[PDB]
mmCIF file of all heavy atoms in Angstrom:
data_model
loop_
_atom_site.group_PDB
_atom_site.id
_atom_site.type_symbol
_atom_site.label_atom_id
_atom_site.label_comp_id
_atom_site.label_asym_id
_atom_site.label_seq_id
_atom_site.Cartn_x
_atom_site.Cartn_y
_atom_site.Cartn_z
ATOM 1 N N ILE L 1 -3.871 91.718 -22.980
ATOM 2 C CA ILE L 1 -3.118 90.715 -22.227
ATOM 3 C C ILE L 1 -4.102 89.841 -21.483
ATOM 4 O O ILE L 1 -4.974 90.360 -20.792
ATOM 5 C CB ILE L 1 -2.154 91.375 -21.229
ATOM 6 C CG1 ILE L 1 -1.187 92.309 -21.943
ATOM 7 C CG2 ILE L 1 -1.389 90.319 -20.428
ATOM 8 C CD1 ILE L 1 -0.252 93.062 -21.012
ATOM 9 N N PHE L 2 -3.986 88.528 -21.622
ATOM 10 C CA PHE L 2 -4.871 87.627 -20.913
ATOM 11 C C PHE L 2 -4.037 86.556 -20.237
ATOM 12 O O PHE L 2 -3.322 85.803 -20.918
ATOM 13 C CB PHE L 2 -5.927 86.991 -21.843
ATOM 14 C CG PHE L 2 -6.834 86.026 -21.114
ATOM 15 C CD1 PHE L 2 -7.658 86.478 -20.093
ATOM 16 C CD2 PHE L 2 -6.828 84.669 -21.409
ATOM 17 C CE1 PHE L 2 -8.491 85.607 -19.401
ATOM 18 C CE2 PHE L 2 -7.650 83.788 -20.711
ATOM 19 C CZ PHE L 2 -8.481 84.266 -19.705
ATOM 20 N N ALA L 3 -4.119 86.486 -18.912
ATOM 21 C CA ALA L 3 -3.357 85.534 -18.121
ATOM 22 C C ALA L 3 -4.320 84.694 -17.302
ATOM 23 O O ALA L 3 -5.175 85.226 -16.600
ATOM 24 C CB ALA L 3 -2.380 86.258 -17.204
ATOM 25 N N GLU L 4 -4.141 83.386 -17.365
ATOM 26 C CA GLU L 4 -4.993 82.480 -16.636
ATOM 27 C C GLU L 4 -4.185 81.448 -15.864
ATOM 28 O O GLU L 4 -3.298 80.794 -16.421
ATOM 29 C CB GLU L 4 -5.952 81.776 -17.589
ATOM 30 C CG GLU L 4 -6.850 80.806 -16.853
ATOM 31 C CD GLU L 4 -7.942 80.189 -17.704
ATOM 32 O OE1 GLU L 4 -8.291 80.724 -18.785
ATOM 33 O OE2 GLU L 4 -8.472 79.138 -17.276
ATOM 34 N N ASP L 5 -4.530 81.311 -14.599
ATOM 35 C CA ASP L 5 -4.012 80.327 -13.676
ATOM 36 C C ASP L 5 -5.181 79.429 -13.283
ATOM 37 O O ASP L 5 -6.259 79.932 -12.995
ATOM 38 C CB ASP L 5 -3.425 81.050 -12.474
ATOM 39 C CG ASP L 5 -3.441 80.209 -11.225
ATOM 40 O OD1 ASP L 5 -2.613 79.283 -11.118
ATOM 41 O OD2 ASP L 5 -4.285 80.484 -10.340
ATOM 42 N N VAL L 6 -4.983 78.111 -13.271
ATOM 43 C CA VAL L 6 -6.055 77.223 -12.839
ATOM 44 C C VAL L 6 -5.793 76.698 -11.440
ATOM 45 O O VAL L 6 -4.730 76.138 -11.160
ATOM 46 C CB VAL L 6 -6.230 76.041 -13.807
ATOM 47 C CG1 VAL L 6 -7.340 75.114 -13.320
ATOM 48 C CG2 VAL L 6 -6.555 76.552 -15.202
ATOM 49 N N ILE I 1 -8.064 79.214 -9.269
ATOM 50 C CA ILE I 1 -8.371 79.836 -10.549
ATOM 51 C C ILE I 1 -8.324 81.350 -10.407
ATOM 52 O O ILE I 1 -9.029 81.924 -9.575
ATOM 53 C CB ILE I 1 -9.761 79.437 -11.085
ATOM 54 C CG1 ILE I 1 -9.883 77.912 -11.197
ATOM 55 C CG2 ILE I 1 -10.043 80.137 -12.414
ATOM 56 C CD1 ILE I 1 -11.282 77.433 -11.488
ATOM 57 N N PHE I 2 -7.474 81.971 -11.212
ATOM 58 C CA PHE I 2 -7.390 83.419 -11.298
ATOM 59 C C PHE I 2 -7.146 83.759 -12.756
ATOM 60 O O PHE I 2 -6.178 83.281 -13.353
ATOM 61 C CB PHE I 2 -6.284 83.982 -10.411
ATOM 62 C CG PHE I 2 -6.208 85.478 -10.464
ATOM 63 C CD1 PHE I 2 -7.159 86.244 -9.834
ATOM 64 C CD2 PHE I 2 -5.224 86.109 -11.197
ATOM 65 C CE1 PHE I 2 -7.116 87.620 -9.920
ATOM 66 C CE2 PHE I 2 -5.182 87.489 -11.275
ATOM 67 C CZ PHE I 2 -6.124 88.233 -10.620
ATOM 68 N N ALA I 3 -8.021 84.572 -13.339
ATOM 69 C CA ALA I 3 -7.919 84.935 -14.748
ATOM 70 C C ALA I 3 -8.077 86.431 -14.876
ATOM 71 O O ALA I 3 -9.030 87.004 -14.351
ATOM 72 C CB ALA I 3 -8.983 84.208 -15.568
ATOM 73 N N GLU I 4 -7.153 87.064 -15.588
ATOM 74 C CA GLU I 4 -7.220 88.504 -15.740
ATOM 75 C C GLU I 4 -6.977 88.885 -17.183
ATOM 76 O O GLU I 4 -6.005 88.436 -17.809
ATOM 77 C CB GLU I 4 -6.207 89.183 -14.820
ATOM 78 C CG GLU I 4 -6.312 90.696 -14.916
ATOM 79 C CD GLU I 4 -5.600 91.439 -13.810
ATOM 80 O OE1 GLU I 4 -5.018 90.818 -12.907
ATOM 81 O OE2 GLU I 4 -5.638 92.693 -13.865
ATOM 82 N N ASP I 5 -7.882 89.714 -17.699
ATOM 83 C CA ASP I 5 -7.774 90.304 -19.009
ATOM 84 C C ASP I 5 -7.551 91.800 -18.836
ATOM 85 O O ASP I 5 -8.350 92.476 -18.189
ATOM 86 C CB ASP I 5 -9.050 90.073 -19.809
ATOM 87 C CG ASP I 5 -8.966 90.696 -21.170
ATOM 88 O OD1 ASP I 5 -8.013 90.321 -21.883
ATOM 89 O OD2 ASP I 5 -9.787 91.563 -21.520
ATOM 90 N N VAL I 6 -6.467 92.292 -19.426
ATOM 91 C CA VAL I 6 -6.114 93.687 -19.428
ATOM 92 C C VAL I 6 -6.253 94.196 -20.867
ATOM 93 O O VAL I 6 -5.428 93.825 -21.713
ATOM 94 C CB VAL I 6 -4.677 93.923 -18.920
ATOM 95 C CG1 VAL I 6 -4.356 95.411 -18.907
ATOM 96 C CG2 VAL I 6 -4.485 93.301 -17.541
ATOM 97 N N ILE E 1 -10.678 96.163 -18.031
ATOM 98 C CA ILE E 1 -9.929 95.165 -17.278
ATOM 99 C C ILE E 1 -10.908 94.286 -16.536
ATOM 100 O O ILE E 1 -11.786 94.808 -15.841
ATOM 101 C CB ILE E 1 -8.959 95.817 -16.279
ATOM 102 C CG1 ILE E 1 -7.992 96.759 -16.999
ATOM 103 C CG2 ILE E 1 -8.198 94.765 -15.489
ATOM 104 C CD1 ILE E 1 -7.065 97.503 -16.066
ATOM 105 N N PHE E 2 -10.791 92.973 -16.670
ATOM 106 C CA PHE E 2 -11.687 92.070 -15.970
ATOM 107 C C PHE E 2 -10.842 90.995 -15.292
ATOM 108 O O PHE E 2 -10.130 90.246 -15.973
ATOM 109 C CB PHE E 2 -12.734 91.440 -16.894
ATOM 110 C CG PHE E 2 -13.650 90.464 -16.172
ATOM 111 C CD1 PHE E 2 -14.472 90.914 -15.148
ATOM 112 C CD2 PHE E 2 -13.636 89.119 -16.466
ATOM 113 C CE1 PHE E 2 -15.301 90.054 -14.455
ATOM 114 C CE2 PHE E 2 -14.465 88.236 -15.765
ATOM 115 C CZ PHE E 2 -15.296 88.711 -14.761
ATOM 116 N N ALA E 3 -10.928 90.936 -13.959
ATOM 117 C CA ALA E 3 -10.162 89.981 -13.174
ATOM 118 C C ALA E 3 -11.119 89.145 -12.358
ATOM 119 O O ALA E 3 -11.989 89.674 -11.655
ATOM 120 C CB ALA E 3 -9.192 90.697 -12.253
ATOM 121 N N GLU E 4 -10.945 87.832 -12.417
ATOM 122 C CA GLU E 4 -11.799 86.925 -11.691
ATOM 123 C C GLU E 4 -10.994 85.893 -10.925
ATOM 124 O O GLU E 4 -10.106 85.242 -11.477
ATOM 125 C CB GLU E 4 -12.763 86.223 -12.645
ATOM 126 C CG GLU E 4 -13.663 85.250 -11.906
ATOM 127 C CD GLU E 4 -14.756 84.634 -12.765
ATOM 128 O OE1 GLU E 4 -15.098 85.171 -13.835
ATOM 129 O OE2 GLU E 4 -15.283 83.587 -12.325
ATOM 130 N N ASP E 5 -11.339 85.751 -9.653
ATOM 131 C CA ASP E 5 -10.823 84.772 -8.728
ATOM 132 C C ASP E 5 -11.986 83.869 -8.338
ATOM 133 O O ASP E 5 -13.070 84.375 -8.051
ATOM 134 C CB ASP E 5 -10.240 85.492 -7.520
ATOM 135 C CG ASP E 5 -10.245 84.652 -6.280
ATOM 136 O OD1 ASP E 5 -9.420 83.729 -6.169
ATOM 137 O OD2 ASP E 5 -11.098 84.935 -5.391
ATOM 138 N N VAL E 6 -11.795 82.561 -8.320
ATOM 139 C CA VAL E 6 -12.868 81.666 -7.897
ATOM 140 C C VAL E 6 -12.603 81.151 -6.485
ATOM 141 O O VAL E 6 -11.541 80.579 -6.219
ATOM 142 C CB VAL E 6 -13.045 80.492 -8.860
ATOM 143 C CG1 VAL E 6 -14.151 79.564 -8.379
ATOM 144 C CG2 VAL E 6 -13.371 80.998 -10.260
ATOM 145 N N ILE K 1 -14.872 83.651 -4.329
ATOM 146 C CA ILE K 1 -15.181 84.285 -5.605
ATOM 147 C C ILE K 1 -15.134 85.792 -5.459
ATOM 148 O O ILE K 1 -15.837 86.375 -4.628
ATOM 149 C CB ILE K 1 -16.576 83.884 -6.132
ATOM 150 C CG1 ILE K 1 -16.691 82.366 -6.249
ATOM 151 C CG2 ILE K 1 -16.853 84.581 -7.470
ATOM 152 C CD1 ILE K 1 -18.093 81.880 -6.541
ATOM 153 N N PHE K 2 -14.284 86.417 -6.267
ATOM 154 C CA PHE K 2 -14.202 87.858 -6.350
ATOM 155 C C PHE K 2 -13.951 88.213 -7.810
ATOM 156 O O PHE K 2 -12.988 87.724 -8.400
ATOM 157 C CB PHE K 2 -13.093 88.427 -5.469
ATOM 158 C CG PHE K 2 -13.013 89.922 -5.522
ATOM 159 C CD1 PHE K 2 -13.966 90.693 -4.887
ATOM 160 C CD2 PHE K 2 -12.036 90.557 -6.257
ATOM 161 C CE1 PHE K 2 -13.925 92.063 -4.965
ATOM 162 C CE2 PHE K 2 -11.988 91.937 -6.329
ATOM 163 C CZ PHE K 2 -12.930 92.685 -5.687
ATOM 164 N N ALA K 3 -14.834 89.015 -8.385
ATOM 165 C CA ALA K 3 -14.730 89.380 -9.796
ATOM 166 C C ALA K 3 -14.885 90.874 -9.928
ATOM 167 O O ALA K 3 -15.841 91.450 -9.406
ATOM 168 C CB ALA K 3 -15.791 88.656 -10.621
ATOM 169 N N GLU K 4 -13.965 91.511 -10.646
ATOM 170 C CA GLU K 4 -14.026 92.948 -10.791
ATOM 171 C C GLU K 4 -13.789 93.334 -12.236
ATOM 172 O O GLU K 4 -12.813 92.889 -12.861
ATOM 173 C CB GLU K 4 -13.014 93.631 -9.869
ATOM 174 C CG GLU K 4 -13.124 95.139 -9.970
ATOM 175 C CD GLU K 4 -12.413 95.887 -8.864
ATOM 176 O OE1 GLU K 4 -11.819 95.264 -7.961
ATOM 177 O OE2 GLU K 4 -12.445 97.136 -8.918
ATOM 178 N N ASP K 5 -14.694 94.156 -12.751
ATOM 179 C CA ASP K 5 -14.586 94.759 -14.060
ATOM 180 C C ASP K 5 -14.356 96.242 -13.897
ATOM 181 O O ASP K 5 -15.162 96.920 -13.238
ATOM 182 C CB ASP K 5 -15.859 94.523 -14.861
ATOM 183 C CG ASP K 5 -15.772 95.140 -16.230
ATOM 184 O OD1 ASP K 5 -14.824 94.762 -16.937
ATOM 185 O OD2 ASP K 5 -16.595 96.014 -16.569
ATOM 186 N N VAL K 6 -13.272 96.731 -14.481
ATOM 187 C CA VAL K 6 -12.925 98.135 -14.484
ATOM 188 C C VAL K 6 -13.063 98.642 -15.924
ATOM 189 O O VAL K 6 -12.241 98.278 -16.772
ATOM 190 C CB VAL K 6 -11.488 98.369 -13.976
ATOM 191 C CG1 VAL K 6 -11.173 99.855 -13.959
ATOM 192 C CG2 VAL K 6 -11.298 97.752 -12.599
ATOM 193 N N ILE J 1 -14.492 72.861 -14.023
ATOM 194 C CA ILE J 1 -14.808 73.494 -15.303
ATOM 195 C C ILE J 1 -14.753 75.001 -15.159
ATOM 196 O O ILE J 1 -15.457 75.579 -14.327
ATOM 197 C CB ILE J 1 -16.197 73.088 -15.833
ATOM 198 C CG1 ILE J 1 -16.309 71.572 -15.945
ATOM 199 C CG2 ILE J 1 -16.472 73.788 -17.163
ATOM 200 C CD1 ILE J 1 -17.711 71.082 -16.231
ATOM 201 N N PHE J 2 -13.901 75.620 -15.959
ATOM 202 C CA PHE J 2 -13.825 77.072 -16.048
ATOM 203 C C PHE J 2 -13.575 77.417 -17.499
ATOM 204 O O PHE J 2 -12.605 76.930 -18.098
ATOM 205 C CB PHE J 2 -12.715 77.631 -15.157
ATOM 206 C CG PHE J 2 -12.639 79.125 -15.210
ATOM 207 C CD1 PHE J 2 -13.586 79.898 -14.581
ATOM 208 C CD2 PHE J 2 -11.654 79.760 -15.947
ATOM 209 C CE1 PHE J 2 -13.549 81.271 -14.658
ATOM 210 C CE2 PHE J 2 -11.609 81.139 -16.023
ATOM 211 C CZ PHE J 2 -12.550 81.884 -15.377
ATOM 212 N N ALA J 3 -14.449 78.220 -18.082
ATOM 213 C CA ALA J 3 -14.349 78.582 -19.491
ATOM 214 C C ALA J 3 -14.498 80.081 -19.621
ATOM 215 O O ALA J 3 -15.459 80.656 -19.098
ATOM 216 C CB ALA J 3 -15.411 77.863 -20.311
ATOM 217 N N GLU J 4 -13.586 80.717 -20.338
ATOM 218 C CA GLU J 4 -13.644 82.156 -20.480
ATOM 219 C C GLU J 4 -13.409 82.540 -21.927
ATOM 220 O O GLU J 4 -12.437 82.088 -22.554
ATOM 221 C CB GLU J 4 -12.634 82.841 -19.573
ATOM 222 C CG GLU J 4 -12.749 84.350 -19.661
ATOM 223 C CD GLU J 4 -12.029 85.093 -18.558
ATOM 224 O OE1 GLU J 4 -11.439 84.476 -17.654
ATOM 225 O OE2 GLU J 4 -12.069 86.343 -18.610
ATOM 226 N N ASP J 5 -14.312 83.364 -22.448
ATOM 227 C CA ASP J 5 -14.202 83.959 -23.755
ATOM 228 C C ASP J 5 -13.975 85.446 -23.584
ATOM 229 O O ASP J 5 -14.777 86.126 -22.934
ATOM 230 C CB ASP J 5 -15.477 83.727 -24.550
ATOM 231 C CG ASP J 5 -15.393 84.347 -25.922
ATOM 232 O OD1 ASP J 5 -14.448 83.972 -26.634
ATOM 233 O OD2 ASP J 5 -16.216 85.216 -26.257
ATOM 234 N N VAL J 6 -12.897 85.939 -24.177
ATOM 235 C CA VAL J 6 -12.548 87.348 -24.184
ATOM 236 C C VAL J 6 -12.680 87.846 -25.608
ATOM 237 O O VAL J 6 -11.865 87.484 -26.462
ATOM 238 C CB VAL J 6 -11.104 87.572 -23.672
ATOM 239 C CG1 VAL J 6 -10.784 89.059 -23.649
ATOM 240 C CG2 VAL J 6 -10.914 86.955 -22.291
ATOM 241 N N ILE Q 1 -10.299 85.369 -27.726
ATOM 242 C CA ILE Q 1 -9.547 84.366 -26.975
ATOM 243 C C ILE Q 1 -10.531 83.494 -26.234
ATOM 244 O O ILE Q 1 -11.407 84.011 -25.536
ATOM 245 C CB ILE Q 1 -8.585 85.029 -25.975
ATOM 246 C CG1 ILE Q 1 -7.616 85.968 -26.698
ATOM 247 C CG2 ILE Q 1 -7.822 83.968 -25.176
ATOM 248 C CD1 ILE Q 1 -6.683 86.713 -25.765
ATOM 249 N N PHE Q 2 -10.414 82.177 -26.370
ATOM 250 C CA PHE Q 2 -11.302 81.275 -25.658
ATOM 251 C C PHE Q 2 -10.465 80.205 -24.985
ATOM 252 O O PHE Q 2 -9.746 79.459 -25.666
ATOM 253 C CB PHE Q 2 -12.359 80.640 -26.586
ATOM 254 C CG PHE Q 2 -13.269 79.670 -25.864
ATOM 255 C CD1 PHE Q 2 -14.090 80.123 -24.842
ATOM 256 C CD2 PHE Q 2 -13.262 78.324 -26.162
ATOM 257 C CE1 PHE Q 2 -14.916 79.261 -24.148
ATOM 258 C CE2 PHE Q 2 -14.083 77.440 -25.455
ATOM 259 C CZ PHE Q 2 -14.909 77.913 -24.459
ATOM 260 N N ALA Q 3 -10.551 80.141 -23.656
ATOM 261 C CA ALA Q 3 -9.784 79.184 -22.863
ATOM 262 C C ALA Q 3 -10.742 78.347 -22.046
ATOM 263 O O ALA Q 3 -11.603 78.876 -21.348
ATOM 264 C CB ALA Q 3 -8.810 79.914 -21.943
ATOM 265 N N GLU Q 4 -10.563 77.039 -22.111
ATOM 266 C CA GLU Q 4 -11.425 76.129 -21.391
ATOM 267 C C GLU Q 4 -10.617 75.103 -20.618
ATOM 268 O O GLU Q 4 -9.722 74.439 -21.169
ATOM 269 C CB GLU Q 4 -12.379 75.429 -22.332
ATOM 270 C CG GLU Q 4 -13.287 74.454 -21.599
ATOM 271 C CD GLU Q 4 -14.376 73.836 -22.459
ATOM 272 O OE1 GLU Q 4 -14.715 74.379 -23.526
ATOM 273 O OE2 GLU Q 4 -14.897 72.789 -22.025
ATOM 274 N N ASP Q 5 -10.960 74.962 -19.346
ATOM 275 C CA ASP Q 5 -10.443 73.976 -18.425
ATOM 276 C C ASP Q 5 -11.611 73.079 -18.034
ATOM 277 O O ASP Q 5 -12.691 73.584 -17.743
ATOM 278 C CB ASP Q 5 -9.857 74.700 -17.213
ATOM 279 C CG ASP Q 5 -9.867 73.861 -15.972
ATOM 280 O OD1 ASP Q 5 -9.040 72.934 -15.862
ATOM 281 O OD2 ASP Q 5 -10.712 74.139 -15.086
ATOM 282 N N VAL Q 6 -11.416 71.762 -18.007
ATOM 283 C CA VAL Q 6 -12.484 70.872 -17.589
ATOM 284 C C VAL Q 6 -12.219 70.354 -16.181
ATOM 285 O O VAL Q 6 -11.158 69.791 -15.908
ATOM 286 C CB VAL Q 6 -12.657 69.694 -18.552
ATOM 287 C CG1 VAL Q 6 -13.772 68.765 -18.066
ATOM 288 C CG2 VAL Q 6 -12.989 70.201 -19.952
ATOM 289 N N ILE H 1 -17.106 89.814 -22.777
ATOM 290 C CA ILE H 1 -16.356 88.815 -22.030
ATOM 291 C C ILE H 1 -17.336 87.939 -21.285
ATOM 292 O O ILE H 1 -18.208 88.455 -20.588
ATOM 293 C CB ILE H 1 -15.392 89.474 -21.027
ATOM 294 C CG1 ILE H 1 -14.422 90.407 -21.750
ATOM 295 C CG2 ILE H 1 -14.627 88.420 -20.230
ATOM 296 C CD1 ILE H 1 -13.489 91.156 -20.810
ATOM 297 N N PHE H 2 -17.215 86.626 -21.426
ATOM 298 C CA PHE H 2 -18.115 85.728 -20.712
ATOM 299 C C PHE H 2 -17.270 84.649 -20.038
ATOM 300 O O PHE H 2 -16.557 83.900 -20.721
ATOM 301 C CB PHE H 2 -19.166 85.082 -21.640
ATOM 302 C CG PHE H 2 -20.072 84.120 -20.918
ATOM 303 C CD1 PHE H 2 -20.904 84.572 -19.897
ATOM 304 C CD2 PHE H 2 -20.062 82.767 -21.214
ATOM 305 C CE1 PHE H 2 -21.723 83.702 -19.201
ATOM 306 C CE2 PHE H 2 -20.892 81.887 -20.506
ATOM 307 C CZ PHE H 2 -21.724 82.357 -19.505
ATOM 308 N N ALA H 3 -17.358 84.588 -18.708
ATOM 309 C CA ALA H 3 -16.593 83.636 -17.915
ATOM 310 C C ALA H 3 -17.554 82.790 -17.107
ATOM 311 O O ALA H 3 -18.411 83.324 -16.400
ATOM 312 C CB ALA H 3 -15.618 84.354 -16.998
ATOM 313 N N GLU H 4 -17.376 81.484 -17.166
ATOM 314 C CA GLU H 4 -18.231 80.582 -16.437
ATOM 315 C C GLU H 4 -17.422 79.547 -15.678
ATOM 316 O O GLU H 4 -16.534 78.890 -16.223
ATOM 317 C CB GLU H 4 -19.189 79.876 -17.388
ATOM 318 C CG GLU H 4 -20.091 78.910 -16.657
ATOM 319 C CD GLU H 4 -21.189 78.279 -17.508
ATOM 320 O OE1 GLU H 4 -21.520 78.823 -18.583
ATOM 321 O OE2 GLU H 4 -21.708 77.238 -17.075
ATOM 322 N N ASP H 5 -17.769 79.411 -14.402
ATOM 323 C CA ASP H 5 -17.254 78.425 -13.479
ATOM 324 C C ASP H 5 -18.421 77.526 -13.082
ATOM 325 O O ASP H 5 -19.500 78.024 -12.797
ATOM 326 C CB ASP H 5 -16.665 79.147 -12.270
ATOM 327 C CG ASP H 5 -16.682 78.303 -11.031
ATOM 328 O OD1 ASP H 5 -15.853 77.383 -10.918
ATOM 329 O OD2 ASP H 5 -17.522 78.581 -10.140
ATOM 330 N N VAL H 6 -18.224 76.212 -13.069
ATOM 331 C CA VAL H 6 -19.291 75.316 -12.641
ATOM 332 C C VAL H 6 -19.031 74.804 -11.234
ATOM 333 O O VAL H 6 -17.968 74.234 -10.963
ATOM 334 C CB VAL H 6 -19.469 74.137 -13.608
ATOM 335 C CG1 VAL H 6 -20.572 73.215 -13.118
ATOM 336 C CG2 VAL H 6 -19.798 74.650 -15.006
ATOM 337 N N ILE F 1 -21.297 77.302 -9.078
ATOM 338 C CA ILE F 1 -21.610 77.937 -10.353
ATOM 339 C C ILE F 1 -21.560 79.447 -10.207
ATOM 340 O O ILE F 1 -22.271 80.027 -9.378
ATOM 341 C CB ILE F 1 -23.005 77.532 -10.880
ATOM 342 C CG1 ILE F 1 -23.124 76.016 -10.998
ATOM 343 C CG2 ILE F 1 -23.282 78.230 -12.216
ATOM 344 C CD1 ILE F 1 -24.517 75.529 -11.285
ATOM 345 N N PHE F 2 -20.708 80.065 -11.014
ATOM 346 C CA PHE F 2 -20.630 81.513 -11.096
ATOM 347 C C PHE F 2 -20.383 81.862 -12.556
ATOM 348 O O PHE F 2 -19.421 81.381 -13.147
ATOM 349 C CB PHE F 2 -19.525 82.076 -10.207
ATOM 350 C CG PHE F 2 -19.442 83.572 -10.269
ATOM 351 C CD1 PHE F 2 -20.400 84.343 -9.638
ATOM 352 C CD2 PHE F 2 -18.459 84.204 -11.005
ATOM 353 C CE1 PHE F 2 -20.351 85.715 -9.717
ATOM 354 C CE2 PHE F 2 -18.417 85.590 -11.075
ATOM 355 C CZ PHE F 2 -19.362 86.330 -10.433
ATOM 356 N N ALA F 3 -21.265 82.674 -13.141
ATOM 357 C CA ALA F 3 -21.155 83.025 -14.548
ATOM 358 C C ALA F 3 -21.310 84.528 -14.672
ATOM 359 O O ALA F 3 -22.272 85.100 -14.152
ATOM 360 C CB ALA F 3 -22.222 82.312 -15.365
ATOM 361 N N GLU F 4 -20.398 85.158 -15.390
ATOM 362 C CA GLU F 4 -20.455 86.602 -15.537
ATOM 363 C C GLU F 4 -20.221 86.981 -16.987
ATOM 364 O O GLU F 4 -19.247 86.533 -17.604
ATOM 365 C CB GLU F 4 -19.441 87.285 -14.620
ATOM 366 C CG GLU F 4 -19.558 88.790 -14.712
ATOM 367 C CD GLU F 4 -18.841 89.543 -13.610
ATOM 368 O OE1 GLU F 4 -18.252 88.916 -12.709
ATOM 369 O OE2 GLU F 4 -18.878 90.796 -13.661
ATOM 370 N N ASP F 5 -21.121 87.809 -17.489
ATOM 371 C CA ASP F 5 -21.015 88.405 -18.805
ATOM 372 C C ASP F 5 -20.782 89.898 -18.639
ATOM 373 O O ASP F 5 -21.590 90.577 -17.986
ATOM 374 C CB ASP F 5 -22.288 88.173 -19.611
ATOM 375 C CG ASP F 5 -22.208 88.792 -20.973
ATOM 376 O OD1 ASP F 5 -21.252 88.413 -21.685
ATOM 377 O OD2 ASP F 5 -23.024 89.662 -21.313
ATOM 378 N N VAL F 6 -19.702 90.387 -19.233
ATOM 379 C CA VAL F 6 -19.356 91.786 -19.231
ATOM 380 C C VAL F 6 -19.491 92.301 -20.663
ATOM 381 O O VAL F 6 -18.664 91.930 -21.520
ATOM 382 C CB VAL F 6 -17.912 92.019 -18.725
ATOM 383 C CG1 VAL F 6 -17.599 93.504 -18.705
ATOM 384 C CG2 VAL F 6 -17.729 91.397 -17.342
#
C-alpha cells in the first residue's frame, strides 16, 4: 500500500 | 508532504 | 514500512 | 522532517 | 519537488 | 511505484 | 526505496 | 534537501 499526500 | 509505504 | 513527513 | 523505516 | 520510488 | 511532484 | 525532497 | 535510501 502506498499513500502520498503533497 | 506525507508519504507512507506499507 | 517507510513513512516520511517533510 | 520525520522519516521512519520499520 | 518530491520524488519517491518504491 | 514511482511518484513525482514538481 | 528512494525518496528525495529538494 | 532531504534524501533517503532504504
Side-chain angles (χ1 to χ4, degrees):
Chain L
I1 302 177
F2 178 63
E4 179 173 341
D5 154 75
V6 179
Chain I
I1 304 170
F2 181 74
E4 183 166 359
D5 180 57
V6 181
Chain E
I1 302 177
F2 178 63
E4 179 173 341
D5 154 75
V6 179
Chain K
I1 304 170
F2 181 74
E4 183 166 359
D5 180 57
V6 181
Chain J
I1 304 170
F2 181 74
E4 183 166 359
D5 180 57
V6 181
Chain Q
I1 302 177
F2 178 63
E4 179 173 341
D5 154 75
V6 179
Chain H
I1 302 177
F2 178 63
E4 179 173 341
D5 154 75
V6 179
Chain F
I1 304 170
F2 181 74
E4 183 166 359
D5 180 57
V6 181

